[PDB]
C-alpha cells in the first residue's frame, strides 16, 4: 500500500523550486512520508518565466497546460493529492473542476483566496515595485478585455460593489464560482473530492479579505464587513456543491497564527501531514 | 593597471546570468588579467533585478548607481562603461548626470539612444510580460500613472504624437534635451574620451533598429528613419554629439546578428581596444 503522489501549485511571486520556498514543503513532505512522488508544478521554461508567468499568464491557459501535464505523468494515473499556496490554492480547485480526470482526491488550501480579493496590499518574494504597478492596474482597470487577458491576478479581482461587473467581465473567478450560470459538471467534480481543506492565516497582511482563504467575502454592496462561507449565496444556493460538501463532513476549515504563508514545522506535520499518508 | 568595467544589463536580465552578463564579465577577465568589473545589480536578489528592469522607475535606478559608483573606491580614479540594449542609455544617462567619478569610454551594445516605438519582442524567455508591457505601452505609455512606473515607457518615443512625447516623457527627453538645453548634460558627455555604438544588422527587438545608432523615424510619421547626422540633436548640437563627432570621440560598430548576438572573436577583435 503506497502514499498518494502530491501536486503542488505555487503562488505568486514564486517558483516551482525555491529551495527557500516549495523546495522547503517538497523536502519536509518527503522525510515524514518516504517514497511519496511530490510533483511541483512549474509554468515556463525557466524559474523566472515561471515567476513572471504567476503575474502575467492567463489562468485559463495556466490550467490546461496543467491538465495535459498531469494527464501525462503516469506515476499520477491512479489519483493524487493536491496543494496550491496562495493563488495555487484556487488553480488547483479549477483543475479539480475542470478536469476530474485522473482524480484529485484531497485539495489543500493554503491561503488560497477562493473568492478572490479586493485590494493587493503587498506582494510576496521581493516584488514590491511589480506589485505596485499591478496594483495600480488593477484599481485603474482590472476588468477590461485588456487586463482581464493579461494579468493574473484581474482575473479573480472581485469588487463586492461593483458586483455585476464583476460577474459579466471576470474571464476566471466567475466562471469557477458559478457566477454566469451553474456547470453542473463542475459541481459534480467538486463534490467527487474525498477533502477540501482550506487553511487560514490569522494574522495575514497580504490578502485581502483574509476570509476568502474560508471562501468567504466582503458581504455585497460594500467593502468593510465580511461573511463566511455560510451566509454567501453560492452556499445557500450550493452552486458548487459546498453545502453538501460542507453537510458530508468533506470540508476542512483550519487556521493557524502568522502572516502570508507562514507556518511551523509542527502545525504542518500536526494538520496537513495526515492529509496526505 | 587596467581601468575597471562597470556593466549594465538589459530588460529581462540580471547582473549575473552565467549564460548572459555572467559570460560578458568571465570574457573581460580572461583578456584583461586583474580587471575589476562592476556588474550592476538593481535589487536584493537576482530576481528581483530582473522585474526592477521593467517596473523600476529609470530615474530612480539611475541615481541609485551614481550613488553607488561614488561610494565605490576602486572607481575614483575613472571607470569604462559597457551598457546592454537598455543599459546602453541609461549608462549614458550616467556619464550626463553623474561626472565624478569620471566614466573613460562609454560602449553601447544595442542601446536605444532614441528610445523605442515599438517592442515586439523581449529578450530570455519572458514573452507573456512583454505581451502585457506592449498593450500597456500602446494603450497609456505617457498617462502619469504608467510613465512613473513602467522602465520601456520612460524611453518610449511616439514621432506622430511627438509633441506628447517631449511633453510627458520623464527619462529619454530629458536625456535627449527635447525641453531644454542641460548645458552640463552636454559638458559631461563630451568629456567621454569615446563613446561607441554597436548596432545589430538582423536586430528583431529593437524598433526602429538605427536608435542603436542615435537615430530615428522621422518626426510625424513611423515608416522612414533618418541617421544621427540629419536630425535636430545633431543640427543645433543640443548634447555635442557634432563636436564629438568631428573630434572622432563617436565610434560607429555594425554586426550582422540579432539583438545581442556577437561572436567572441568580433568582441576580442572591436570592443576589448576601448576597454
Redesign the interface.
Known amino acids: 500500500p503506497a502514499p498518494l503522489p502530491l501536486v503542488i501549485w505555487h503562488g505568486m511571486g514564486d517558483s516551482c523550486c525555491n529551495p527557500l520556498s516549495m523546495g522547503a514543503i517538497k523536502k519536509m513532505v518527503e522525510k515524514k512520508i518516504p517514497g511519496i512522488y511530490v510533483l511541483s508544478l512549474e509554468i515556463?521554461?525557466?524559474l523566472?518565466?515561471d515567476?513572471?508567468?504567476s503575474?502575467?499568464?492567463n489562468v485559463n491557459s495556466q490550467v490546461t497546460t496543467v491538465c495535459q501535464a498531469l494527464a501525462k505523468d503516469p506515476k499520477l494515473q491512479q489519483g493524487y493529492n493536491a496543494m496550491g499556496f496562495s493563488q495555487g490554492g484556487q488553480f488547483l480547485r479549477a483543475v479539480a473542476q475542470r478536469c476530474p480526470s485522473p482524480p484529485m482526491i484531497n485539495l489543500i488550501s493554503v491561503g488560497g483566496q477562493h473568492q478572490g480579493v479586493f485590494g493587493l496590499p503587498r506582494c510576496p518574494?521581493?516584488?514590491s515595485?511589480?506589485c505596485?504597478?499591478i496594483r495600480?492596474?488593477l484599481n485603474?482597470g482590472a476588468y477590461s478585455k485588456?487586463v482581464q487577458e493579461?494579468?493574473v491576478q484581474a482575473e479573480y479581482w472581485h469588487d463586492p460593489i461593483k458586483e455585476d461587473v464583476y460577474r459579466n467581465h471576470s474571464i476566471f473567478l466567475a466562471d469557477i464560482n458559478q457566477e454566469r450560470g451553474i456547470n453542473e459538471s463542475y459541481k459534480k467534480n467538486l463534490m467527487a473530492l474525498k477533502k477540501f481543506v482550506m487553511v487560514k492565516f490569522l494574522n495575514d497582511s497580504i490578502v485581502d479579505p483574509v476570509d476568502s482563504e474560508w471562501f468567504g467575502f466582503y458581504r455585497s454592496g460594500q467593502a468593510k464587513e465580511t461573511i463566511p462561507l455560510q451566509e454567501t449565496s453560492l452556499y445557500t444556493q450550493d452552486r458548487l456543491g459546498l453545502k453538501e460538501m460542507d453537510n458530508a463532513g468533506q470540508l476542512v476549515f483550519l487556521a493557524t497564527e502568522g502572516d502570508h504563508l507562514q507556518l511551523s514545522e509542527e502545525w504542518f506535520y500536526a494538520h496537513i501531514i495526515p492529509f496526505l499518508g
Open positions: 515556463g521554461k525557466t523566472m518565466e515567476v513572471e508567468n503575474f502575467f499568464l518574494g521581493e516584488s515595485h511589480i505596485d504597478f495600480k492596474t485603474a485588456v493579461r494579468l
